[PDB]
Each structure stands twice: as structure tokens, then as C-alpha cells.
Design a protein around this ligand. Structure first.
Ligand code: SF4
Ligand SMILES: [Zn+2]
Ligand SMILES: [Zn+2]
Ligand SMILES: [Zn+2]
Ligand SMILES: [Zn+2]
Lengths: 32, 752, 356
């Protein structure tokens, strides 16, 4: 298992993709 | 990815591909379809083995011919890497085609590397392992056990368990690496060595070392089962000539002859003992000898001859025994007086070099041994020993060397020379006579291979110049080209240092190895680079003796104490197991950030297959040109043969030989294109060898770096390392150095 | 052409800025700043020396960090003689850390660095931190070798299990273990290991770390934190403070226990309740609704006005139009305002002016 990862060429694999979450903020509140 | 060639679909195991790899694949396909041999020089920083397997595997699975594939590497470690890559490639195909296609791939090696016996795998010598395995697998124990179960002779459960199942069911369909092969066989109590050798005729792709194709001793048995139209690949064949020469070379010492007489006397005593009690065996063997049978017709396929055929199969006489050595006693007397002639020829006082014909003529004069009986020495001995019930062969082990010499000298007469030297070691109190039989022509061993097989591919990372190999080895190529990597940003910095910080010239000439200025200048270079090299540093020396002397000098001066503060020091040692542990420690030290420096020999075990991709190698320090020992009788004779026959100048070959090793070490640092490292050649003599380096390395060597000082080298290295630590711009390599599927199609359209 | 050269280079510089999306970021941070004080830091590649410049930039970083992260906490660790030395505990007082850094500036650095000791010390310092805070470690590494007592790989595995995030700033070259530490600890991301190329780039690298790091989608720790807004009170006579036990004129009164505190934001010394003013929360809103970048208008079309909407700077007529418009409100802005509207302000005046 470990040997297989080392022998593989990382540069030829898919580039790392960010998995950060998006947030949409609705805005509404009661008056004072 | 899965792209198309003119008519061959090929499945690449990666979503991306380099421009060189596609061009490499296209040329290979052209050679296979057109036929003939070719020489391809691909950079070490681009996937070569994966490209070879991808195209070749698709070629065998697509065309109706279904030609098999023969893969030849230089070391056992390379076989493991090739098999691992093959497993990864086959897994990708099995995931894209939706099913596991009929495919078998196995690696080959000696019993020592595949023996699972708890009592026979604990041996430090391969010869002993072979003897023990043959004793438990020859069949004498099985036959004796059948007659009388009370016999104390043991068997090998691994070998015995194979008889239950058929050959086609030894292993499941697929590719079995050595790591996987041992695990599968251990769980079922089977012998991996026998499983592989019995399945060669069924494997689609077979991987073994060059010794299994060029050495007549072991190649004949393996070669007899492979196909004739299979594809042959010579990976990392930049040092194939050394393997070819060493296959038909022998060295005889005084101790070897002294041990031969004892074996011969023991053999005569054994014959007398057998003559008294059991004389029918000798007569039965004699009767077959009179008929004209040989070892092949008499020995069973299960058993192996005691003396391996030391000559090529095409040079063995097919006639009956001459009759002089037909009887056991006559052959022993023939052998005994042959040993005496060798012994009396070891008392020479000056170096004498003579052709085999002159040696035969002198042999025919002092004694009355003819050429024809000499050619059958090895063949006859294997028959006599087999019929003698020699279960313990410790005494007769030495006789194998004499038989090998007799069959070699009496068979070949051109391209071979006999050297007798009164001093094996010039610095010795007592002379140590030695008799060397050296093979000068490097094409004799490889001639059958280039004729038996139609298509042969010769590939290596630093095979240059390409024109000399056809000159040295008598063969012709349909095409020979070298690729240049299209790297967007410089990833390796090759430099040549001619003088130290004090502007004093530095060289590794053996005659001046004990020089306080050169030793200090080299030591200063090592310390200065170790300060900037982040994790790993590999140091290659021209010879092991040079490393011993220079390293000891550094210890006295105190250089090592300064090096110890930054990195751990690991040194290659003659012992193989100790060296392997050093590599394990060196790799562990580089991975954890402790930092380590490895001192090795350019012509050693490290340089012939060990890789230092990314962290394990970040700087290569070539301490001097790895020139061979010029004052060597074997080398000098070899140079003369090439000059007279192939019209190769002595200086040109020596420089070519040295450079082929220096480049060899340089290519063991780059894996892919995200890898980087600084290559420094520390010798004033490298300044004029730029044209002799590989094209992909020479192109990266600037005109300003041809002759640098130590201080100037450090400044450039520090700048280069800083530059390579920045995040690479993806757009700078989207389609100029790495190709996606869409880009590959575009390239196929513009070209068409 | 010289001015055009800047524009084309500016467009390339704007190419990266085009892709801006409101990624979720952890406003509540708990940073552990680690500095390397070893023999390798005595070099002169940075004038006067690495130790002096790094300390000087550290002081600036502390000021900026607390300026934009009022409700975060920081801890300072240094490497000396192969050991990790604590010089500042996790606290919300910017002055205590600055004072500690000033003292360190005197002693000459010596010895070898030890990542494992520093990481282990950082691991213990972040243990008593709430689950809603983002545990981060910033390391200024200059050496090319590491001497550690144990296995670094085990520490890396522990850090991932503890959900800590590590950022490393190198000086000379990339270290394999550092790359693995920054990659295995950032869910495989390789952009958290930066190597500087000059003094100027270092300032940008320090400034970049001030902003909160985006969170991962699979890492969820959402919760509600109980906070309090004390009311400032003015007193005629000095009274003992509940944090330092010294006479002070006045202090904010906690609404849960009425205990007084010298300054904010700090944890209440009595009810262990976080005291923050409304302004402190307002300092981080720009990270949740970042202002959309402005796109230059081609000269082919006709412009609206000759003067800038916000600063009344007459647009230079002169080639490429020196005007940038807001997509939301479609109002042209000069080059100067866009820098000031995206670095100082975070609200487009045009959008606010438009009625709904
Ligand atoms: S048969 Fe296989 S396991 Fe048994 S002794 Fe021979 S090599 Fe070893
Ligand atoms: Zn107080
Ligand atoms: Zn309170
Ligand atoms: Zn303006
Ligand atoms: Zn607007």
C-alpha cells in the first residue's frame, strides 16, 4: 500500500481542489 | 486518459500526459509496426516506464498477433518498480474496460530472493541456497522416499504442494509483484520461484534482469520457453556492455587450483568406492555415452546440470563424446593433469597475454590434451557427478570453475584473451598469481538476442552518444533519437566547478589523492553545500578506494565534525545488507527533516537502480570524473580490441565510459517535473565534456556555468533553490509542459 | 507604453482578484505564533540579521492581528537550545505580548530548533480552548534541519486529530517535513507553506496571515457562544480592578455579576464571561459580506461622468479608460478609490446612495 503511493507520479494526478464551504447571509431584523 | 494513435487505442493511467511521453509513444509504435531495433533516450524527469507499459500493453491487447512483451532491467530492485507500475496501469484498465482481461505478468529472480523455506532462506550465499533447493527438488529424495519411507531425507512442502494443482492454476489471473507474490504463496505454502519459472510460457509480459538473457549459464533454460516474436525492451541499458562482458569472463587464483586438486582426489576416491559396491551405474552411463546421448537427453527436466553451460547454446558441439573422457577413470585423469598444467602456468614472473589458440597449442605440447575433449569438459562432468550419488557436493564445488574454464577456452578463439599476472595486488608482500580469462568483444554475448528476436527497443535515461552503441554492439537501428524535456521553468541547475574558493584547480586524479590542498578544497565544497542543501545530498566518488582515503583525511582534518552539525552522514559499505540499512536510515532522515548526506561510489551498487526522487535527492555532488583504473591489463586489452576492430580511439572510449557513469548518477534525482535539484560536477576535466553529456542535461548547462568556483557555485545554488520554492503559475504549464485530454487532441489535429 | 505596461501588468494582477466568493471563515481565532531563534538565524541575508528583522515584523504583526481580530487570542513561543520556550500565555491583551517580544529582542539567538518541542508546546497551549475557536499555529522557520527527541510524524498525526491548522513561513528553501506538516494539516492543501524571496515579500506574507482562514466544508463546529455587552460607567473615586487588583478611575461593569474590568475585550474574572463591545463585532463583518471587486470599463463605450463619484477626482482623459464600475450599482470609480474602498472601507457608496 505505502510503496504504491510512492511509485506513482503525483505531478500527473489531478490538481488538488479546494473544498471550502460558501455561505449566503440573509439580512432582516425588527425595528428598535 | 484514453486517447488514440493512428490505429491503436491506448489507455494512460493518469488524467494528464507530458508532450515527451506522447512523442515517445508515437515513435515506439512506429518501430513496432515497421520492425527492427531502435534506441530511444528519454529524460529521467518524465514518466518512462509507465509510458512503455501503457503503449506496449495496449499493443498486445489490440492487434490480432497478440505479441508477448519481454522487459529487461539491470537490477532486481528495478523489476519491483516495473511490476508496481504495471499493477497500477492494469488496475486503471480494469476500471475503464469494466472487466479484468486475461493477463498474466510475473517477475523473475534467483531462489535466494523467493525461497520461503524456514531453513534454506537463512543463507548468506546464493550458491548454497541453490544446492539445498536442488537436493530437495532434484527428485532423488522423492524417489528414495517412494522405495523406502524410512529414509531420513526430507522434502519441501512448497514444492510438493504444487503437484496437486495444475500449472494454469498456480496463480489467479492478473499481475503479481514480488511483494504480492510472496504473500499469496505464503498463505498457500507454495514456492514462488518454481511457480514463476513454470508459467513463463503463459505470461503476457515477463520481467527479468539482463543476466537472465545474456548470461548463457542461466539464460538458456529461461530462453527456451519464451516466444520468438515477443517484444523485447532494454530499459536502462546504458551499461549493457559490462553485463555482456562479465558473462563470458573468468578469474582463477592459486587458492582455486589448490582447492581443485582436493576435489579431484575426492572424486577419484568416490569413484573407487562406487566401483566396489555399485558398478552398474557407471556401465549404464557408459552405454548411453557410447550411443551419442548428451545431458539434455539423459537428465530429466526436473533436475539441473551440475555445471551450467558456460558457452552460448549455438556453440555447443552436437557430436558424441570423443571417447577419451568416456570412462570415469579416464576423465578424472584427464581432469587431473589439466589442473596441473594450470598450476605450473601460475609460476610466471611477468605479465603474459596470449590468445586461446596459443594457450591450446602450448597445452597440446606439454601434455596431450586435444581441443575437442576440452570442449566437452563441463558437459561430461555434469553427467559423472549426477551418476555418482554426490548428495554432498562441498568438495566438488571448486571443480565447477575448472570445467567452466576448459569449456570457454576451447570454444571461443576471437575476441577473447588470457591474462596471467604475478601480482593480483601490486602492494603485496608475497606475490599472488592470478589467471584471468577476459572477453574483449562485447557483441558476442548479445549476438543471439539480436538475431532470435526481430524487434528490440533499447531505452535509457542517459544513453548518449547513440551512435557508439551500434558501433560497439554489431546491430542496426531503424531510428535513434533523444527527446528534450519542454519544461516551462528551469527545474534542475547543472553546474561544473573547476576550482575552489581559493581559485585553485581541483581534480580527483588518483596519483594526487593525498594532497592537502585538493582534499581541503573538496571538503570545503562538501561543507558549504551541506549548509544550503535542505534535506538530502548524494555524493558520488570515482572509486571506493578514493572514498576511503579522502574520507579518512577529512576525519583527521575535522571536516566531518562540522558536517555532523547539519546532517547525518551515511556511507556506502562493501556489505550489501549494511548498505541497504544505510539507505533505509538515509530515507528516514530525509523524510523527518533531520537532513542526511549519503556518500556513495558512482560505479557502486547505489548508482545502478536506487532513485532519489524529490526529498531523498536535492543536490548531486560528483567528486571528480569516475575514470576507470587505466593501468589495468583487462581494460588495456579491451581498449586495444576496440581500436583495431571498431576503430574507436582509446581516449574517446575512456571518456565515454566515464561520462556514461557520471550521467547515470545525474538522472536519479528527477521524478516528474515538479521535482528539482542542483547537479554539480566537481572536476576541472568536466569543463570540456559538455558535448558528451545527455542532450536533456547539456541543454540545461549554461555557458557561464562551464567553469565556476566554489563561492560562485554556492551563490547560484542559493538563488536557484529560493526561486524553485515559489508557487508555480498553473497557466505557465497548462499546455506547454503538461497536456490534458483536450490539449492532446489539439496536438493530434495540428500535426495531422 | 510605460504607463500601458503598468496597466497590462495591473490587469494580470487583477486576474487573481477577479475570483472572489464569500467563503465561510472562522472569525474566532486562537493563534500560536512560533519563532525560530537558532544559530542559522544569525545570518546577514536580512539586514541587520534575521532575528532582528523577524522580531521587528512580529511587533507589527501583533498590532495588525489584534486590530482586525479583536476577539481572538495569541500565544508566543520561541525555539532556543533545541527547546521550546514559552514567553507569553494565550491572552487577549496586545500590550503583554508586545512587551514580551521586546524583551526577547535583546538576547542573542543560539542553539538548534526543534519542531516537535514547539509543536508539542503549541498542542498543550491550545488544549484549553473552546470548540468554536479555530486553533492555528504560525511558525517562522529559518533553519534547514530539525533536531527532535521523538518521531515528528506521530506529532503530525496528533495535530490533525486535534483539528489544528499550521502555517509555516520559510526563509531559504522548502523542507520536506514542513511541506508535509502544512499539507497533511490543511486537508491536503499545499498553499499554506510559503517561502519568501526578499524583505518586501515577507511583509506581505505577514499581512496575509492576519485575515481569517476559510473553513472546510466537512469540518462543522457550529454553535452559539454566550457573550455580554457591559455598560461603561464613570466614577468619581478610583476603585480596585477585578483583573489586576489595582486602583483605577473607572471600568466597564459586567451585566451578569457587576464586576468591573479595566479594558475590553477580556474574559470576565468572576463569571468567566466574554466582554465585547458592539464595535468589536463590527470589525469582522467585512469578512462575511466582502465588497465585490470593480471591473474596468473598455474605452470603446461612452463613460458617464468626467469626475469620480466618490472623491471627485477628474478622470484623466489621455488609451485604456481609467474607470472602474460597480456591478451592483453601475457607478464608475477612479483607480485610487478602488484601492481605498477595498483596503480601508468595505462598502460601495453608490449602492448605499441608490434608494429601494
Ligand atoms: S522449492 Fe522453493 S521454498 Fe523449497 S527450498 Fe527450493 S526455493 Fe526454497
Ligand atoms: Zn485591572
Ligand atoms: Zn461578569
Ligand atoms: Zn475616486
Ligand atoms: Zn456599487
Amino acid at each position: 500500500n505505502d510503496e504504491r503511493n510512492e511509485l506513482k507520479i503525483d505531478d500527473l494526478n489531478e490538481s488538488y481542489k479546494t473544498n471550502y464551504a460558501i455561505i449566503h447571509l440573509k439580512r432582516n431584523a425588527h425595528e428598535k | 486518459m484514453k486517447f488514440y494513435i493512428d490505429d491503436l487505442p491506448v489507455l494512460f493511467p493518469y488524467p494528464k500526459i507530458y508532450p515527451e511521453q506522447y512523442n515517445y509513444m508515437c515513435d515506439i509504435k512506429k518501430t513496432l509496426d515497421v520492425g527492427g531495433n531502435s534506441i530511444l533516450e528519454m529524460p529521467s524527469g518524465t514518466g518512462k516506464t509507465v509510458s512503455l507499459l501503457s503503449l506496449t500493453i495496449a499493443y498486445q491487447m489490440h492487434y490480432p498477433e497478440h505479441r508477448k512483451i519481454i522487459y529487461c532491467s539491470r537490477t532486481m530492485s528495478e523489476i519491483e518498480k516495473a511490476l508496481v507500475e504495471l499493477e497500477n496501469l492494469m488496475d486503471y484498465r480494469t476500471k475503464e474496460l469494466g472487466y479484468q482481461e486475461d493477463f498474466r505478468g510475473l517477475g523473475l529472480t534467483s531462489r535466494k530472493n523467493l525461497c520461503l523455506h524456514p531453513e534454506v532462506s537463512k543463507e548468506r550465499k546464493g550458491t548454497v541456497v541453490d544446492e539445498k533447493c536442488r537436493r530437495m527438488t532434484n527428485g532423488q529424495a522423492k524417489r528414495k522416499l517412494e522405495e523406502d519411507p524410512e529414509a531420513n531425507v526430507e522434502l519441501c512442502e512448497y514444492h510438493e504442494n504444487l503437484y496437486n494443482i495444475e500449472v494454469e492454476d498456480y496463480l489467479p489471473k492478473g499481475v503479481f509483484s514480488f511483494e504480492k507474490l510472496l504473500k499469496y504463496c505464503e498463505e498457500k505454502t507454495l514456492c514462488p520461484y518454481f511457480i514463476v519459472r513454470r508459467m513463463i510460457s503463459l505470461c503476457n509480459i515477463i520481467i527479468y534482469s539482463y543476466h537472465y538473457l545474456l548470461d548463457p549459464k542461466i539464460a538458456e533454460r529461461v530462453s527456451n520457453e519464451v516466444s520468438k516474436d515477443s517484444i523485447v525492451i532494454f530499459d536502462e541499458a546504458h551499461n549493457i556492455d559490462n553485463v555482456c562482458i562479465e558473462s563470458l569472463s573468468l578469474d582463477l587464483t592459486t587458492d582455486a587450483l589448490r582447492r581443485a586438486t582436493r576435489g579431484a582426489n575426492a572424486l577419484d576416491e568416490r569413484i573407487s568406492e562406487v566401483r566396489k559396491v555399485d558398478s552398474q551405474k557407471l556401465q549404464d552411463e557408459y552405454e548411453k555415452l557410447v550411443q551419442g546421448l548428451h545431458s539434455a537427453d539423459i537428465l530429466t527436466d526436473q533436475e539441473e546440470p551440475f555445471v551450467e553451460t558456460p558457452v552460448l547454446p549455438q556453440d555447443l558441439l552436437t557430436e558424441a563424446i570423443p571417447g577419451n573422457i568416456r570412462r570415469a577413470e579416464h576423465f578424472v585423469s584427464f581432469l587431473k593433469r589439466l589442473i596441473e598444467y594450470l598450476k605450473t602456468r601460475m609460476k610466471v614472473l611477468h605479465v603474459i597475454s596470449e590468445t586461446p589458440k596459443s594457450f591450446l597449442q602450448h597445452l597440446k605440447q606439454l601434455t596431450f590434451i586435444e581441443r575437442k575433449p576440452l570442449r566437452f569438459c563441463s558437459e561430461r562432468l555434469s553427467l559423472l557427478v549426477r551418476t555418482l550419488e554426490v548428495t554432498e557436493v562441498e568438495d566438488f564445488t571448486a571443480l565447477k570453475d575448472i570445467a567452466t574454464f576448459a569449456t570457454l577456452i576451447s570454444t571461443y578463439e576471437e575476441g577473447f584473451l588470457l591474462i596471467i599476472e604475478p601480482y593480483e595486488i601490486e602492494n603485496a608482500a608475497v606475490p599472488n598469481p592470478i589467471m584471468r580469462f577476459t572477453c574483449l568483444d562485447a557483441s558476442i554475448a548479445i549476438k543471439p538476442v539480436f538475431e532470435r528476436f526481430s524487434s528490440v527497443i533499447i531505452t535509457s535515461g542517459t544513453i548518449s552518444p547513440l551512435d557508439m552503441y551500434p558501433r560497439m554492439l554489431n546491430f542496426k537501428t531503424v531510428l535513434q533519437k533523444s527527446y528534450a524535456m519542454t519544461l516551462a521553468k528551469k527545474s534542475f541547475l547543472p553546474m561544473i566547478i573547476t576550482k575552489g574558493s581559493d581559485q585553485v584547480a581541483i581534480s580527483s586524479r588518483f596519483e594526487i589523492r593525498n594532497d592537502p590542498s585538493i582534499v581541503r578544497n573538496y571538503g570545503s565544497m562538501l561543507v558549504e553545500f551541506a549548509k544550503i542543501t535542505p534535506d538530502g545530498m548524494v555524493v558520488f566518488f570515482p572509486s571506493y578506494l578514493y572514498m576511503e582515503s579522502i574520507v579518512s583525511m577529512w576525519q583527521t582534518m575535522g571536516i566531518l565534525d562540522e558536517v555532523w552539525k547539519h546532517k547525518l552522514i551515511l556511507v556506502e559499505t562493501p556489505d550489501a545488507q549494511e548498505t541497504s540499512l544505510a539507505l533505509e536510515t538515509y530515507r528516514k532522515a530525509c523524510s523527518n527533516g533531520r537532513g542526511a548526506i549519503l556518500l556513495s561510489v558512482a560505479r557502486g551498487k547505489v548508482s545502478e537502480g536506487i532513485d532519489f526522487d524529490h526529498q531523498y535527492g536535492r543536490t548531486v555532488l560528483m567528486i571528480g570524473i569516475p575514470f576507470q583504473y587505466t593501468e589495468s591489463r583487462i581494460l588495456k586489452a579491451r581498449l586495444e580490441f576496440m581500436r583495431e576492430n571498431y576503430r574507436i580511439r582509446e581516449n574517446d572510449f575512456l571518456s565515454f565510459d566515464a561520462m556514461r557513469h557520471a550521467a547515470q548518477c545525474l538522472g536519479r534525482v528527477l521524478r516528474g517535473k515538479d521535482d528539482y535539484g542542483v547537479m554539480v560536477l566537481a572536476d576541472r576535466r568536466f569543463s570540456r565534456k559538455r558535448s558528451q553529456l545527455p542532450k536533456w542535461i547539456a541543454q540545461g548547462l549554461s555557458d557561464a556555468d562551464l567553469n565556476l568556483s566554489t563561492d560562485m557555485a554556492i551563490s547560484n545554488t542559493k538563488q536557484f533553490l529560493r526561486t524553485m520554492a515559489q508557487p508555480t503559475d498553473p497557466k505557465d504549464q497548462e499546455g506547454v509542459s503538461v497536456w490534458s485530454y483536450e490539449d492532446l487532441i489539439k496536438h493530434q489535429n495540428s500535426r495531422k | 507604453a510605460s504607463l500601458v505596461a503598468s496597466i497590462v501588468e495591473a490587469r494580470k494582477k487583477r486576474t487573481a482578484k477577479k475570483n472572489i466568493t464569500p467563503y465561510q471563515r472562522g472569525i474566532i481565532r486562537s493563534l500560536i505564533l512560533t519563532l525560530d531563534c537558532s544559530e542559522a538565524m544569525l545570518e546577514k541575508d536580512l539586514r541587520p540579521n534575521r532575528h532582528a528583522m523577524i522580531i521587528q515584523y512580529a511587533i507589527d504583526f501583533v498590532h495588525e492581528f489584534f486590530d482586525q481580530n479583536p476577539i481572538s487570542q495569541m500565544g508566543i513561543i520561541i525555539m532556543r537550545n533545541g527547546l521550546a520556550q514559552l514567553v507569553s500565555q494565550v491572552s487577549g491583551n496586545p500590550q503583554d505580548h508586545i512587551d514580551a517580544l521586546k524583551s526577547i529582542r535583546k538576547q542573542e539567538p543560539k542553539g538548534n530548533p526543534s519542531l516537535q518541542n514547539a509543536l508539542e508546546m503549541a498542542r498543550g497551549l491550545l488544549l484549553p480552548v473552546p470548540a468554536h475557536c479555530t486553533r492555528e499555529v504560525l511558525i517562522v522557520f529559518g533553519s534547514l534541519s530539525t533536531t527532535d527527541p521523538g518521531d515528528i510524524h506521530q506529532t503530525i498525526d496528533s495535530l490533525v486529530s486535534e483539528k489544528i491548522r499550521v502555517k509555516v513561513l520559510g526563509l531559504s528553501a522548502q523542507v520536506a517535513i514542513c511541506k508535509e506538516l502544512c499539507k497533511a494539516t490543511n486537508y491536503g492543501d499545499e498553499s499554506f507553506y510559503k517561502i519568501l524571496l526578499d524583505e518586501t515579500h515577507l511583509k506581505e506574507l505577514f499581512n496575509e496571515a492576519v485575515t481569517p482562514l476559510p473553513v472546510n466544508k466537512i469540518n462543522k463546529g457550529f454553535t452559539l457562544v454566550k457573550m455580554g455587552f457591559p455598560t461603561r460607567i464613570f466614577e468619581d473615586t478610583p476603585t480596585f480592578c477585578s483583573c489586576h487588583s489595582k486602583l483605577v478611575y473607572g471600568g466597564y461593569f459586567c451585566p451578569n455579576c457587576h464586576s468591573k474590568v479595566c479594558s475590553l475585550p477580556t474574559v470576565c474574572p468572576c463569571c468567566d464571561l466574554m466582554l465585547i463591545l458592539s464595535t468589536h463585532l463590527a470589525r469582522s463583518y467585512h469578512h462575511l459580506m466582502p465588497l465585490k471587486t470593480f471591473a474596468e470599463v473598455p474605452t470603446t463605450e461612452k463613460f458617464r461622468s468626467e469626475d469620480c463619484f466618490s472623491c471627485q477626482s477628474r478622470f484623466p482623459i489621455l488609451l485604456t479608460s481609467s474607470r472602474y464600475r460597480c456591478e451592483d450599482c453601475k457607478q464608475e470609480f477612479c483607480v485610487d478609490c478602488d484601492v481605498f474602498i477595498h483596503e480601508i472601507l468595505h462598502n460601495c457608496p453608490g449602492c448605499e446612495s441608490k434608494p429601494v
